[PDB]
Design a protein around this ligand. Structure first.
Ligand SMILES: Nc1ncnc2c1ncn2[C@@H]1O[C@H](COP(=O)(O)OP(=O)(O)OP(=O)(O)O)[C@@H](O)[C@H]1O
Ligand SMILES: Nc1ncnc2c1ncn2[C@@H]1O[C@H](COP(=O)(O)OP(=O)(O)OP(=O)(O)O)[C@@H](O)[C@H]1O
Ligand SMILES: Nc1ncnc2c1ncn2[C@@H]1O[C@H](COP(=O)(O)OP(=O)(O)O)[C@@H](O)[C@H]1O
Ligand SMILES: [Mg+2]
Ligand SMILES: [Mg+2]
Ligand SMILES: [Mg+2]
Lengths: 240, 183, 52, 219, 209, 232, 97, 98, 240
């Protein structure tokens, strides 16, 4: 054995083992989904409450990268915060150098290259966070991208990460998201997260929702409280 | 498939007589692609029988005129090519070329009473290059005997015809011949 | 030098010229020398027949 | 091949005897039942149901499968870290069902003389076939299922050759549909892929370590 | 590489007695049969005529190491010892010749090759270039090959063909011809058959050199 | 970043360097080559073989000119050859800048050998896997030299390297002498390369280089075909 | 001379996966429209012996909830219930030499 | 093409001038139908057909394992048209050790 | 056959070999895709397949073809992240050559520079040698079309018909059989042969939505990607 100790050793069959171990580290995160509408995207995260001592709003997993770009993370929190910081610095550097807001097709690529740089050498370890970038622009429409720790980024119409990723995407595909505006999408996102993670696994949890699109004139922010209240009120009806 | 070709045949039976052989080319594809289908056991065989009858009729009409030797070779080569492009072994398990060769042989034996060099000698050279296959062994015999007999009777000569007839060492080997004819 | 087949050829030539001059012992000796020097060749494809 | 009793002196045949089985096989049949109701298990609510629907329901409700045109699953594996409730489930199942229960362990099949192990395997299946609804439980399966390999000086072969008989009483040339197979292990990266095939071991249940709420119930 | 065809040809063309056995027939369920079955063979060959004995696959009974605690090893040891004794007992006057064939000569007991027992070692290597042309010519002299098929195209090819599958090349090409209901072999048949039988890609990483 | 900074080549208990031996074993499996000099110039012959007809035989070359009168051929690993070629070109350039004269052959050989030796003592690296032949013509007398992964070098009259180099050396022993001409040298070089060559030798499987007091150049395939004919 | 022909029997192309699904799916009292092409598109590198299992799991999902017929959603669950369990089987293909 | 035709129409090969192959092996990954093929051939071809798994022709006495093979080939020789199918031959066909 | 750390890093084994490099060659096959390149009398064609297993994934961003320069095109196989990094390096190198020398870069020099960069990884014992392949096509003055291939061991070459991927051997055999006939080559013939090679190697009879084609020719040396409609046009013209 011993072929799986460094990040610079090909196994005899020809593949790297440390990155696969990072993957398996990701698969124990909670859940996070994100789907794009006619004129924007919507993120959704279910956050578990470990004990009653903690305060609401603690350790948000829905990060705000730039003035029009948002991020949702899953994995180990420390590495996720480091990646958020490096992406934020890179975006500011781009705006200073050229003179306008960076497009997604460039920011996602740069962050992906920086993540992939940590999978060749034996002096550093691979990252352990999988994350999603979302945005909306008037001249380019809605954009959604997903990046994994191995260093791969793709574009999606809708994606899910965490434990029950495939179970979530099963009900994701049933939707005809290609048509409706993402004002009624909030209700269906709430419904699709309340139909997973049985109460046997854990007692209580909470919902975190983001918002970006032409409805906000390009800004990215959390949903208003009343709207989320109505959304969860609607989603509770799955008990039928 | 089956009756559509019958309707086309009943339609162009008159057209071929009124028109020239160029329409034969226009009728070459639609039949050949049918051999590509081969969905049923006997439809394709009857089809290719009809088209071989058409080809032999065109051959008779052409060899009636000066189109005796210059176009029969093209006919045989093109029919071999159509077999090549269609399913091997001439479309189906049935020879579907046996009938064509037999009809052409009958034409060679009877119609060409004036066996000029090009009408018979060239036509035999053309038709004897279908010798290799087993399915049509019996015909290549009769044709070989007829060729040798014609050469001997018309011109006399010797040695070469004897050599030609001898080379059919498979006379013993041929299973599906009448015993007396072999003798 | 390296070449050994040409040695066999010229030895056979001397054998023939002595035999044509009616000198049996020297001709037999030259033929024997040619046979000894022709046993180490990898393949004499046509020369072998002439030697024999 | 029939077995007959014979007069010692004339050698005239006098009786036909019942078929005989190796005593080591007749010894691996339970006779005094365990006594462990599913109440005595905590946290495993999914795995219990996935076992019971797979190897108890097809015994009592044959028509419920026949009336839909399907074949019940062929066999179940259960795996996971040591100290989780695997052998406890085997004891529970044996305590609730009525069927004939055969209990066995992998290392018990390794035998010194060539060909002696395969005989025990086929003789155990042949015994279970006769006791109509029987089920058979193989513990410590990783003592047999070790992956085959290529070698040119010296290697291991006798155990591989008994495994190739086991892999043929399951599935194989003639289907046997009447006996239920359970097997257990705590390491799976060892086992031969040809044993894991979907036709032989059909449901591969996995046992996790108990989360916070289960430990309270165990204690 | 054709060890057995020499035995067959000499058996066909001989004028004296011939006996053939298989080395694995001597082991017997009843103990004590092996030595008897050796000594009676030697006695028959001795008293009969200028005989010739042939044994195929001697690896079954003539090996190197033993384990004197299992029954079977003891029996094989007795067989080998008695065979050595019986072969050694000849008096350089009787006209009996022994032929033995084997596949892997590295696992043989050295004592069997001592002078006076097996003094001749003959090796049957792989055909190289000259034997390929002769084998193709002799194998294909029976078939109906058409006057269009070249054999020098296939002989010069680099791959290290044995002698036991040139026959397979010809046989498979004949089968391809039969499938077509045609009784004359064409060049495409040899081409396809040669492609099918060998099927060796490269295994030849080319930055090696 | 950073490297390792510790030697990977160390001394064995029997007083031998293992890695150099393994590099030489890798060299011994390369394509064969031959080199001769006779009183007027030098001849370098090497054998090349594409795996299939798909490869373009005129795209890459084996014999490479360092400058107007130095030639170099190799036997062993492929990719490592270009690094050495490039380094030799650079070194010749610095020499010519400093002294305003074409570099002598011996100096270039010494510098290249020094680089190759230094590459087996530093940290976190492995030695090269090629053996080189260098030829030149300065001040009338032709020169031929051979390098070594260990860094040592020798001067030769005739040399064979690659597969079956022992047979080549023995063959050259009974043939070579000290008084021939370039044409006869070419003839004997092709003759000795035919010992382990393929079945049929074509005008494109062989690369030949010639140096005389007129300069180094690579023979075009036409005259290579002319030389292959009327011989053997 | 001892084993003359060597016949490779190999994992199915998608067309064959459709053929085998139509073989093993028939006898089930299936109900409503079914689109086998989605299944054929998800199942990749499956053995023939897994498609039988997909067909058994589909009915097993409907024995629960007291139905007596099968609908396409059941097939779409069972396909993934099987497809992810193949992760713990070694992936080597062996070939004579 | 190997097992069925030269059993029933043998003169064709005689005319062309070859002898048909004697045997073939089926190989490939698990679960691709290798035994199902042989079951179908056995069910739908009229001949004599011995069928055994090679793992179970071995026993501990000194010579039976070879005697039984000689017996089964003799049986096949007497009953002239016959097929031998034996499965999982890696159980006894393994490379020979030193 | 091994002694010490020869199985874990890039040093010579006793026989003279090294395995940490020939492991990358079988790491190439992990993608499970094949690409073909053909060179004609006055044009060059690159063809590959693409597979989209899920409807949620956006099919417009799964291309393996990349525009290295307005006159030079490439195709990649193997791990995706490494291929993207090599594309980045190639773009930078071509731009630098244009800046420094004042005229366009030949394709062979670019391939040589890339191979020389890649050769270092198999020289030092702290890096991993990037298991991804390389195929480039271009047009050169007084030479016509050119097709070059590069591998992780640092071995570059110039071909007339190439295939890279899982089915390399039999595809090369089929191409050799076709090219030995020595027939005239035009645009339509080259494209038809390239498509039929993959079609008969995989035996699919596919649709105009599962392959990608790139072409260059001496009438507009710009590298261009065929649109689906004209791809369907060639596909139907191929089937008489
Ligand atoms: N002239 C020839 N030289 C060699 N082999 C030939 C020749 N002619 C035919 N063969 C083929 O060689 C094959 C080798 O058969 P044979 O039984 O003699 O092999 P063997 O060398 O004894 O093999 P083994 O040691 O494996 O039993 C024959 O089946 C035959 O088809
Ligand atoms: N091509 C196929 N068509 C139909 N069913 C198949 C096919 N391949 C496998 N099966 C199914 O596989 C099951 C049994 O597999 P089978 O007996 O063929 O094993 P095998 O492929 O020979 O495996 P092993 O190599 O382990 O012996 C049956 O349910 C049969 O329907
Ligand atoms: N609810 C439970 N879950 C898991 N293990 C339990 C539970 N209750 C008791 N046990 C303990 O688990 C042990 C069962 O052995 P087990 O862990 O199955 O061994 P193995 O898993 O190696 O077969 C018993 O000692 C029992 O005390
Ligand atoms: Mg236990
Ligand atoms: Mg033999
Ligand atoms: Mg089987």
């Amino acid at each position: 054995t011993g072929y799986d100790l460094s990040a610079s050793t090909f196994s005899p069959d020809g593949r790297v083992f440390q990155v696969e171990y990072a993957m398996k580290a990701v698969e124990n995160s909670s859940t996070a989904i994100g789907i794009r509408c006619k004129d924007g995207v919507v993120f959704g995260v279910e956050k578990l409450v470990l004990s009653k001592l903690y305060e609401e709003g603690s350790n948000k997993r829905l990060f705000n990268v730039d003035r029009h770009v948002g991020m949702a993370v899953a994995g180990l929190l420390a590495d996720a915060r480091s990646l958020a910081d490096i992406a934020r610095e890179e975006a500011s550097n781009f705006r200073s150098n050229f003179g306008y807001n960076i497009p997604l097709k460039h920011l996602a690529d740069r962050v992906a290259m920086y993540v992939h740089a940590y999978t060749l050498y034996s002096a550093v370890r691979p990252f352990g966070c999988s994350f999603m970038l979302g945005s909306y622009s008037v001249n380019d429409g809605a954009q959604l991208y997903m990046i994994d720790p191995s260093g791969v980024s793709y574009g999606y119409w809708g994606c899910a990460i965490g434990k029950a990723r495939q179970a979530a995407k099963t009900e994701i595909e049933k939707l005809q998201m290609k048509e409706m505006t993402c004002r009624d999408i909030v209700k269906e996102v709430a419904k699709i997260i309340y139909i997973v993670h049985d109460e046997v696994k854990d007692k209580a949890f909470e919902l975190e929702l983001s918002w970006v699109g032409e409805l906000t004139n390009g800004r990215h922010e959390i949903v208003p409280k009343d709207i989320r209240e109505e959304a969860e009120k609607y989603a509770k009806e799955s008990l039928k | 498939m089956a009756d559509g070709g019958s309707e086309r045949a009943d339609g162009r039976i008159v057209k071929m007589e009124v028109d020239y052989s160029a329409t034969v080319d226009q009728r070459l594809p639609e039949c050949a692609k049918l051999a590509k289908e081969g969905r049923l056991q006997e439809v394709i065989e009857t089809l290719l029988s009809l088209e071989k009858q058409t080809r032999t009729a065109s051959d008779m009409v052409s060899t009636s005129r000066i189109l005796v030797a210059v176009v029969k070779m093209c006919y045989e080569a093109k029919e071999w090519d159509l077999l090549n492009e269609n399913i091997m072994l001439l479309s189906k398990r049935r020879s579907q070329l046996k009938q064509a060769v037999a009809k052409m042989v009958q034409q060679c034996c009877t119609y060409v009473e004036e066996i000029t060099d090009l009408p018979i000698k060239l036509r035999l050279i053309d038709t004897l290059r279908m010798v290799t296959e087993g399915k049509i062994y019996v015909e290549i015999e009769r044709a070989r005997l007829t060729k040798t007999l014609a050469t001997i009777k018309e011109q006399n000569g010797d040695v070469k015809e004897a050599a030609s007839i001898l080379q059919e060492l498979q006379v013993e080997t041929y299973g599906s011949m009448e015993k007396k004819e072999r003798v | 030098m390296d070449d050994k087949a040409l040695l066999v050829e010229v030895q056979l030539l001397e054998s023939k010229t002595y035999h044509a001059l009616s000198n049996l012992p020297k001709a037999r000796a030259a033929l024997t020398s040619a046979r000894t020097t022709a046993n180490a060749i990898y393949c004499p494809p046509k020369l072998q027949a002439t030697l024999d | 091949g029939d077995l007959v009793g014979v007069n010692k002196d004339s050698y005239l045949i006098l009786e036909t005897l019942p078929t005989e089985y190796d005593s080591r096989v007749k010894a691996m049949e339970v006779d005094e039942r365990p006594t462990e109701q599913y109440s005595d298990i905590g946290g495993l609510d999914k795995q219990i149901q996935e076992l019971v629907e797979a190897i108890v329901l097809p015994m009592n409700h044959k028509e419920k499968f026949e009336n839909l045109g399907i074949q019940p699953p062929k066999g179940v594996l259960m795996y996971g870290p040591p100290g989780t409730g695997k052998t406890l489930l085997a004891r529970a199942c044996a305590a609730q069902t009525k069927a004939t229960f055969l209990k066995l362990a992998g290392p018990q099949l390794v035998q010194m003389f060539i060909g002696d192990g395969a005989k025990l395997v086929r003789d155990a299946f042949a015994l279970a076939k006769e006791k109509a609804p029987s089920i058979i439980f193989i513990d410590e399966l990783d003592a047999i299922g070790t992956k085959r390999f290529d070698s040119e000086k010296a290697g291991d072969r006798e155990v591989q050759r008994t495994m190739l008989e086991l892999l043929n009483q399951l599935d194989g040339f003639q289907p046997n549909t009447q006996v239920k197979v359970i097997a257990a292990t705590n390491r799976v990266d060892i086992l031969d892929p040809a044993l894991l095939r979907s036709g032989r071991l059909d449901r591969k249940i996995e046992f996790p370590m108990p989360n916070e709420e289960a430990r309270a119930r165990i204690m | 590489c054709g060890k057995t065809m020499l035995a067959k040809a000499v058996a066909h063309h001989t004028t004296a007695a011939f006996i053939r056995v298989v080395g694995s027939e001597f082991v017997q369920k009843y103990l004590g049969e092996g030595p008897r079955m050796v000594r009676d063979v030697f006695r028959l060959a001795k008293e009969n005529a200028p005989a010739i004995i042939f044994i195929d696959e001697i690896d079954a009974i003539a090996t190197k190491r033993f384990d004197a605690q299992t029954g079977a090893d003891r029996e094989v040891q007795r067989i080998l010892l008695e065979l050595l004794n019986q072969m050694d007992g000849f008096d350089q006057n009787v006209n009996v010749k022994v032929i033995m064939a084997t596949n892997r000569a590295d696992t043989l007991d050295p004592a069997l090759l001592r002078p006076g027992r097996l003094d001749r070692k003959i090796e049957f290597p792989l055909p190289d270039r000259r034997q390929k042309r002769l084998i193709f010519s002799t194998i294909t002299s029976k078939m109906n090959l058409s006057e269009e098929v070249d054999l020098e195209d296939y002989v010069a090819r680099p791959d290290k063909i044995s002698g036991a599958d040139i026959n397979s090349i010809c046989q498979e090409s004949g089968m391809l011809a039969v499938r077509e209901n045609r009784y004359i072999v064409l060049a495409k048949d040899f081409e396809k058959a040669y492609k099918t039988v060998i099927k060796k890609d490269e295994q030849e990483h080319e930055f090696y050199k | 970043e950073r490297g390792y900074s510790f030697s990977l080549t160390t001394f064995s208990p029997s007083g031998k360097l293992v890695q150099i031996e393994y590099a030489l074993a890798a060299v011994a499996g390369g394509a064969p080559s031959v080199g001769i000099k006779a009183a007027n110039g030098v001849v370098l012959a090497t054998e090349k073989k594409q795996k299939s007809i798909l490869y373009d035989e005129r795209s890459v070359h084996k014999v490479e000119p360092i400058t107007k009168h130095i030639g170099l051929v190799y036997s062993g690993m492929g990719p490592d050859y270009r690094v050495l070629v490039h380094r030799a070109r650079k070194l010749a350039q610095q020499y010519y800048l400093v002294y305003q004269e074409p570099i002598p052959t011996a100096q270039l050989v010494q510098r290249v050998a020094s680089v190759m030796q230094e590459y087996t003592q530093s940290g976190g690296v492995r030695p090269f896997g090629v053996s080189l032949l260098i030829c030149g013509w300065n001040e009338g007398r032709p020169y031929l030299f051979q390098s070594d992964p260990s860094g040592a070098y020798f001067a030769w009259k005739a040399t064979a390297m690659g597969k079956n180099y022992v047979n080549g050396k023995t063959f050259l022993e009974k043939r070579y002498n000290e008084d021939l001409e370039l044409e006869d040298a070419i003839h004997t070089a092709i003759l000795t390369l035919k010992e382990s060559f393929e079945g049929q030798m074509t005008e494109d499987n062989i690369e030949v280089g010639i140096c005389n007091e007129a300069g180094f150049r690579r023979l075009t395939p036409t005259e290579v075909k002319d030389y292959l004919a009327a011989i053997a | 001379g001892r084993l003359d022909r060597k016949i490779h029997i190999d994992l199915p192309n998608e067309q064959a996966r459709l053929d085998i699904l139509k073989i093993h799916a028939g006898p089930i009292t299936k109900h409503g429209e079914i689109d086998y092409e989605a299944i054929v598109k998800l199942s990749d590198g499956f053995n023939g012996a897994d498609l039988r299992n997909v067909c058994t799991e589909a009915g097993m999902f409907a024995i629960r909830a007291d139905h007596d017929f099968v609908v396409q959603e059941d097939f779409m669950k069972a396909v993934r219930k099987v497809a992810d369990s193949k992760k713990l089987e070694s992936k080597l293909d062996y070939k004579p030499v | 093409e190997v097992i069925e035709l030269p059993l029933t129409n043998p003169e064709l090969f005689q005319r062309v001038g070859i002898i048909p192959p004697k045997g073939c092996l089926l190989y490939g990954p698990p679960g691709t139908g290798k035994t199902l093929l042989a079951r179908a051939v056995a069910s739908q071809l009229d001949c004599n057909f011995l069928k055994v798994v090679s793992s179970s022709i071995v026993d501990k006495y000194i010579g039976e394992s070879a005697r039984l093979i000689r017996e089964m080939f003799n049986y096949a020789r007497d009953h002239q048209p016959c097929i031998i199918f034996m499965d999982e031959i890696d159980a006894i066909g393994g490379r020979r050790f030193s | 056959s091994s002694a010490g750390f020869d199985r874990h890093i890039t040093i010579f084994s006793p026989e003279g070999r090294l395995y940490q490099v020939e492991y990358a060659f079988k790491a190439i096959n992990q993608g499970g895709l094949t690409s073909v390149a053909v060179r004609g009398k006055d044009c060059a064609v690159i063809v590959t397949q693409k597979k989209v297993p899920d409807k949620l994934l956006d099919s417009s961003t799964v291309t393996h073809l990349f525009k290295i320069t307005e006159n030079i095109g490439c195709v990649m196989t193997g791990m995706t992240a490494d291929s993207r990094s090599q594309v980045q390096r190639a773009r930078y190198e071509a731009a630098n050559w244009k800046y420094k020398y004042g005229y366009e870069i030949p394709v062979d020099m670019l391939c040589k520079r890339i191979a020389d960069i890649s050769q270092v990884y198999t020289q030092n014992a702290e890096m991993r040698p990037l298991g991804c392949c390389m195929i480039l096509i271009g047009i050169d003055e007084e030479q016509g079309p050119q097709v070059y291939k590069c591998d992780p061991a640092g071995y570059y070459c110039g071909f007339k018909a190439t295939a890279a991927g899982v089915k390399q051997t039999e595809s090369t055999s089929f191409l050799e059989k076709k090219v030995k006939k020595k027939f005239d080559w035009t645009f339509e013939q080259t494209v038809e042969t390239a498509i039929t090679c993959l079609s008969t190697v995989l035996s699919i009879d596919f649709k105009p939505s599962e392959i990608e084609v790139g072409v260059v020719t001496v009438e507009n040396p710009k590298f261009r990607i065929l649109t689906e409609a004209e791809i369907d046009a060639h596909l139907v013209a191929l089937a008489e």
